[PDB]
């Protein structure tokens, strides 16, 4: 076997996979195996990209026997995996050991589950014909518009409050002041009218927040950054922020936004896409209501 991994605590794996089910449940996940660990990436409509990474120390029997360039790809349907795993991993403290296997290329993804003298073995055939490779919605750190670190619980509560309101179009605000009264909020408009959820300047949920001038070194005060993001991406990310410790916000002048989720724990990084243009001249009325 080229890749092998074993784990005893499947609660972490299943709660990490539950954060991918709102949109990634359909198909077309590109798992990566390397010396760093195990990673899953999902990208639909080329509008949002999610990366969930599993470290070496998470697995107990990581071997990774290879004699190549050390980068092998495989694409498997998520829905088959979810349907297979739904029946197992039942009850609590079932000490279900999961064994991962992949014989390089042309072999199905093999999962072995053992639960109280009862073993299971599911083979997941992959799809590697039209794999265009490369891909990735990456951004350069030399021109980051602003950086923000927020608590996971506050963001989860904000998103779960925003979801049921509606708000098919959402906005992201960034603002810094000289008196350390930093302003950060995710406002939106809906049929209800105007919805404003505000994250205060308290360091409990706004530990770090600075607005840059496109050089990632020159921090400035009194400058406003407007981010027009669709409701779909925020709805998809709401589940991913349900269980977390710290959430990192970072977008550049290009408008693409990278959100890092910390939960040692695993790291989840998601890349977003901004809308082409703001609706007419709305951004003006966003600030005009913000200092109102």
């Amino acid at each position: 076997n080229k890749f092998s991994a074993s784990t005893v605590h499947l609660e972490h794996i299943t709660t990490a996979l539950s954060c991918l089910t709102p949109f990634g449940s359909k198909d077309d996940v590109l798992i990566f195996i390397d010396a760093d660990g195990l990673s899953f990436v999902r990208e639909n409509n080329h509008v949002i990209k999610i990366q969930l990474l599993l470290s070496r120390e998470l697995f107990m029997s990581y071997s990774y026997r290879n004699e190549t360039e050390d980068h092998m790809k495989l694409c498997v349907k998520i829905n088959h995996i979810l349907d297979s795993v739904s029946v197992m991993n039942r009850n609590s403290d079932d000490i279900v050991e999961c064994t991962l296997s992949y014989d390089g290329h042309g072999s199905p993804f093999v999962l072995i589950f053992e639960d109280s003298f009862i073993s299971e073995r599911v083979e997941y055939s992959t799809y590697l014909i039209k794999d265009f490779d490369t891909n990735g919605l990456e951004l350069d750190r030399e021109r980051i518009s602003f950086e923000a670190i927020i608590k996971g619980e506050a963001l989860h509560s904000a998103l779960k409050d925003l979801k049921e309101i509606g708000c098919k179009e959402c906005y992201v605000y960034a603002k810094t002041e000289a008196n350390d009264e930093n302003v950060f909020a995710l406002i939106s408009k809906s049929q209800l009218g105007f919805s404003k959820i505000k994250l205060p300047s308290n360091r409990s949920i706004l530990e770090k927040l600075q607005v840059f001038d496109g050089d990632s070194t020159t921090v400035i005060d009194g400058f406003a950054v407007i981010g027009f993001f669709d409701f779909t991406s925020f709805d998809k990310i709401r589940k991913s922020t349900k269980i977390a410790s710290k959430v990192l916000f970072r977008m550049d002048v290009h408008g693409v936004l990278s959100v890092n989720i910390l939960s040692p724990g695993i790291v989840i990084e998601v890349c977003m896409l901004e809308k082409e243009s703001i609706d007419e001249a709305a951004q003006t009325e966003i600030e005009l209501l913000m200092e109102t």
């Binding site: 042309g106 072999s107 799809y127 590697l128 014909i129």
Partner: peptide
């Protein structure tokens, strides 16, 4: 079936 990998 036109996306399934070539079996080893």
């Amino acid at each position: 079936f036109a996306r399934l990998t070539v079996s080893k």
